[PDB]
Amino acid sequence: ASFWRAIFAEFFATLFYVFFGLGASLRWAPGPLHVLQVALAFGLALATLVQAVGHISGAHVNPAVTFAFLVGSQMSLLRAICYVVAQLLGAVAGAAVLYSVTPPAVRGNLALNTLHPGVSVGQATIVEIFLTLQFVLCIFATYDERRNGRLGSVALAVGFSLTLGHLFGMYYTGAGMNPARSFAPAILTRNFTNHWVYWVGPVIGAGLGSLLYDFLLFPR
Amino acid sequence: ASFWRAIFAEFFATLFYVFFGLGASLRWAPGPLHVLQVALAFGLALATLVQAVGHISGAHVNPAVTFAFLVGSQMSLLRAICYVVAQLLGAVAGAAVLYSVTPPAVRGNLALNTLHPGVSVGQATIVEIFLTLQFVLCIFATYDERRNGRLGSVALAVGFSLTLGHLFGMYYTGAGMNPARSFAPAILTRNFTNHWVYWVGPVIGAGLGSLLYDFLLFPR
C-alpha cells in the first residue's frame, strides 16, 4: 500500500538520518567549530532524504515533526503513530549499524544528546522548543503548497532549517530537535539522562510551531 | 612540627595542584591539541609547587607518589597516610574552590578522568601504570641526591615528566597519574565510574616504578 511504502520510507529515511547525522557527530579528528560540519551533516542528510522520500511519506523522519502534522491535522492519529514507531525503529537501527561500522575508539557517546554544562533543563527545554519551533514552522511553510514560484528547493529549505537549529542549539543541547535522533543513542548507550528534555522540547516546539503557523501566520 | 608543616604543605600544594591543573582542563574555548596546554598546566603547576613545598614535604601532592616513597622505604607508614589524607583533602578542596570561582557553563565535568571511548579498563590501567611508572621513576631519580652537576632544576624535571605523562595519556585516560587528582572531581561530580582504574593504575605504576628504580636501575 501507499501507506507501508510510506511507513517503510520513514523507517529507512530515519535509519539513514541517524546513521549519517549521528555518524558525522562521531567527532573523529574534527577540532573547533566542528558544529559547522555536523550541522551541514544533519542538514544535508535531511535535504537528501527529503529528496528521496519526500513524496513517499513527507519525510518527517522526526517524531516531533509527525506530531506537528498530527496536531496540524494533516495525519490520522493512526498514521502519526506508525511514523513515530517506524522513525524510532529506523533510528535505533541506523544507530546500531553506525555502531557496527564505527571503531569503538571513535563512536564515543554515539553522539548522544546531553545538555551542555551550565544549561538547566528548563533552558535546555526552551532551546529545544525553539530549535524545533522554527524547524517545524519552516516545514509547515515550505510543504504548504499554497505558495510557489520564488520558493525554491523544498528539501534544501527544510534541511538548512535543520542546519540552522544545529548551528545554534548544538552548543546548548547538542541540538536534538528530533525525539528519534535523541532516542536511538540513548537506548543503545542505555543513557537516558535528561532524555525527556529531548521529547518535551521538540514536541512542544513542534506543536507550538504547528499552531503558530496554522491559526496565525498563515491560517486555513 | 616539621611534620604538620609538611602535612599542611601537602594539603595546600595539592589544593593548588588540583585548582590549577584541573582549572586549566576546564576547556573554555581551547579547541584542538588542547592537550598541549593542559599538560604544560599540570606540569608547571607541579614544578612550581615542588619549588615552594619541595623542601617542606617532598611535594608528593600525589597519593601514588607518596606510595612509591612508602614502598621505596622513605616514609613511615604513618606519614604516608597523613600525606594521602592531606592530599585527598587538599584535592577535594582545590576542586571545590575551582568550582566556586568557575562559571557553571565552563566547569563541565570538572575535568573528571574518564577512559577515552574504545579504551578498555585493562588498557586504561596499563596506560596509567606507565604514565605513573615513568613519572615516579623520574622523581625517584631527580630526588635521589646521589646525583648532581649536570642534573638541573629538580622541579622542572619532575614537572615535565608530569607533562610527558599528559602529552601521552591524556588521550587514553585523561591522564590521571594521581589518585588525588582523579578523586577530587569524582567525589564532587559524584561520578566514580571506572574510578578504580585511577588508583590501581597509579598505585601499581608508582610501586613498580619505585622498585624498578631501587632494586634495579640504581639500587641502594
Coordinates of C-alpha atoms in Angstrom, one line a residue, chain B residues 28-217:
Chain B
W28 CA 36.8 27.1 28.0
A29 CA 37.4 27.9 24.3
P30 CA 40.5 25.6 23.7
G31 CA 40.0 23.7 20.6
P32 CA 42.4 21.1 19.1
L33 CA 45.7 19.9 20.8
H34 CA 44.3 21.4 24.0
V35 CA 46.4 18.6 25.4
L36 CA 49.5 20.8 25.0
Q37 CA 48.1 23.5 27.2
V38 CA 46.7 21.2 29.9
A39 CA 49.9 19.1 30.0
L40 CA 52.0 22.2 30.5
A41 CA 49.4 23.3 33.0
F42 CA 49.8 20.3 35.3
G43 CA 53.5 20.2 34.5
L44 CA 54.2 23.8 35.5
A45 CA 51.7 23.5 38.4
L46 CA 53.9 20.7 39.7
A47 CA 57.3 22.3 39.0
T48 CA 56.1 25.4 40.7
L49 CA 54.5 23.6 43.7
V50 CA 57.6 21.5 44.0
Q51 CA 59.6 24.8 44.0
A52 CA 57.7 26.0 47.0
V53 CA 56.9 22.9 49.0
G54 CA 59.6 20.6 47.7
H55 CA 61.6 21.2 50.9
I56 CA 58.6 21.2 53.3
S57 CA 57.4 17.8 52.4
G58 CA 58.9 16.5 49.2
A59 CA 55.9 17.9 47.3
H60 CA 54.4 14.5 46.5
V61 CA 50.9 16.0 46.2
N62 CA 50.1 12.6 44.7
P63 CA 48.9 9.7 46.8
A64 CA 50.6 7.4 44.4
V65 CA 53.9 9.2 44.7
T66 CA 53.7 9.1 48.5
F67 CA 53.0 5.3 47.9
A68 CA 56.2 5.0 45.9
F69 CA 58.2 6.6 48.7
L70 CA 56.5 4.3 51.3
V71 CA 57.4 1.1 49.4
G72 CA 60.6 2.8 48.5
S73 CA 61.1 2.9 52.2
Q74 CA 61.5 6.6 52.5
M75 CA 58.4 7.3 54.6
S76 CA 57.0 5.9 57.8
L77 CA 53.6 4.1 57.1
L78 CA 52.2 6.7 59.5
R79 CA 53.4 9.8 57.5
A80 CA 52.5 8.2 54.1
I81 CA 48.9 8.0 55.4
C82 CA 48.8 11.7 56.5
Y83 CA 50.0 12.7 53.0
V84 CA 47.4 10.6 51.2
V85 CA 44.8 12.2 53.5
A86 CA 46.1 15.7 53.3
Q87 CA 46.4 15.2 49.5
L88 CA 42.9 13.9 49.1
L89 CA 41.6 16.7 51.3
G90 CA 43.7 19.3 49.6
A91 CA 42.5 17.9 46.3
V92 CA 38.8 18.0 47.0
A93 CA 39.3 21.4 48.5
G94 CA 41.2 22.7 45.4
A95 CA 38.3 21.3 43.3
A96 CA 35.6 22.9 45.5
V97 CA 37.2 26.3 45.2
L98 CA 37.9 26.0 41.4
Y99 CA 34.2 25.0 41.3
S100 CA 33.1 28.1 43.2
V101 CA 35.1 30.5 41.0
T102 CA 34.3 28.8 37.8
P103 CA 31.1 29.5 35.8
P104 CA 28.7 26.6 35.7
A105 CA 28.8 26.6 31.9
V106 CA 32.6 26.2 31.9
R107 CA 33.1 23.7 34.7
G108 CA 31.8 20.9 32.7
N109 CA 32.7 17.5 34.2
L110 CA 35.2 19.4 36.5
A111 CA 37.9 17.7 34.4
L112 CA 37.0 14.3 35.7
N113 CA 39.2 11.4 34.5
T114 CA 37.4 9.0 32.1
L115 CA 38.7 6.3 29.9
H116 CA 38.5 7.5 26.3
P117 CA 35.9 5.6 24.3
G118 CA 37.3 2.3 22.9
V119 CA 39.9 2.1 25.7
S120 CA 39.3 -0.9 28.0
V121 CA 40.0 -0.8 31.7
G122 CA 42.8 -3.2 31.4
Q123 CA 44.4 -0.9 28.9
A124 CA 43.4 2.2 30.8
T125 CA 45.2 0.5 33.7
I126 CA 48.3 -0.4 31.8
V127 CA 48.5 3.2 30.4
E128 CA 48.0 4.7 33.9
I129 CA 50.7 2.3 35.2
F130 CA 53.0 3.7 32.6
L131 CA 52.1 7.4 33.0
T132 CA 53.0 7.0 36.6
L133 CA 55.8 4.5 36.3
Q134 CA 57.9 6.9 34.3
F135 CA 56.7 9.7 36.5
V136 CA 57.7 8.0 39.8
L137 CA 60.9 6.9 38.2
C138 CA 61.8 10.4 37.2
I139 CA 61.0 11.6 40.7
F140 CA 63.0 8.8 42.4
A141 CA 65.7 9.8 40.0
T142 CA 65.8 13.5 40.4
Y143 CA 65.1 13.5 44.2
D144 CA 67.9 10.9 44.7
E145 CA 70.6 13.3 45.8
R146 CA 73.2 10.6 44.8
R147 CA 73.4 12.5 41.5
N148 CA 74.1 16.2 40.7
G149 CA 76.1 18.6 38.5
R150 CA 74.5 18.3 35.0
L151 CA 71.3 17.4 36.8
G152 CA 69.4 20.7 36.5
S153 CA 66.2 22.0 38.2
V154 CA 64.7 19.1 40.0
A155 CA 61.2 20.8 39.9
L156 CA 61.2 21.4 36.2
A157 CA 62.3 17.8 35.8
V158 CA 59.6 16.1 37.8
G159 CA 57.1 18.6 36.3
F160 CA 58.0 17.9 32.7
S161 CA 57.7 14.2 33.5
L162 CA 54.1 15.0 34.5
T163 CA 53.7 16.9 31.3
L164 CA 55.1 13.9 29.5
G165 CA 52.5 11.6 31.0
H166 CA 49.8 14.1 30.0
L167 CA 51.1 14.7 26.5
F168 CA 50.6 10.9 26.0
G169 CA 47.9 9.5 28.3
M170 CA 45.6 12.4 28.2
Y171 CA 44.1 10.9 25.2
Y172 CA 43.6 7.5 26.8
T173 CA 42.6 8.0 30.4
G174 CA 42.5 11.8 30.5
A175 CA 45.9 11.2 32.3
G176 CA 45.3 10.9 36.0
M177 CA 48.6 9.5 37.3
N178 CA 47.4 10.8 40.6
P179 CA 44.7 9.2 42.7
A180 CA 44.0 12.6 44.4
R181 CA 43.6 14.4 41.1
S182 CA 41.1 11.8 40.0
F183 CA 39.3 11.6 43.4
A184 CA 38.5 15.3 43.9
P185 CA 36.3 15.7 40.8
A186 CA 34.9 12.1 41.2
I187 CA 33.5 12.9 44.6
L188 CA 32.3 16.4 43.8
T189 CA 30.8 15.4 40.4
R190 CA 29.8 12.3 42.5
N191 CA 30.8 10.2 39.4
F192 CA 33.0 7.3 40.4
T193 CA 32.7 5.5 37.0
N194 CA 35.8 3.4 36.2
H195 CA 37.4 5.4 39.1
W196 CA 39.4 2.4 40.4
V197 CA 41.4 2.3 37.2
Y198 CA 42.7 5.6 38.6
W199 CA 44.0 4.1 41.8
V200 CA 45.1 0.7 40.7
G201 CA 46.9 2.2 37.7
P202 CA 48.9 4.9 39.6
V203 CA 49.5 2.7 42.6
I204 CA 50.9 -0.2 40.6
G205 CA 52.7 2.1 38.3
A206 CA 54.0 4.0 41.3
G207 CA 55.1 1.0 43.3
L208 CA 56.6 -0.7 40.2
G209 CA 58.4 2.5 39.3
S210 CA 59.7 2.6 42.9
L211 CA 61.1 -1.0 42.8
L212 CA 62.4 -0.7 39.3
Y213 CA 64.4 2.3 40.3
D214 CA 65.5 0.8 43.6
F215 CA 66.3 -2.9 43.3
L216 CA 67.4 -2.4 39.7
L217 CA 68.4 0.7 37.7

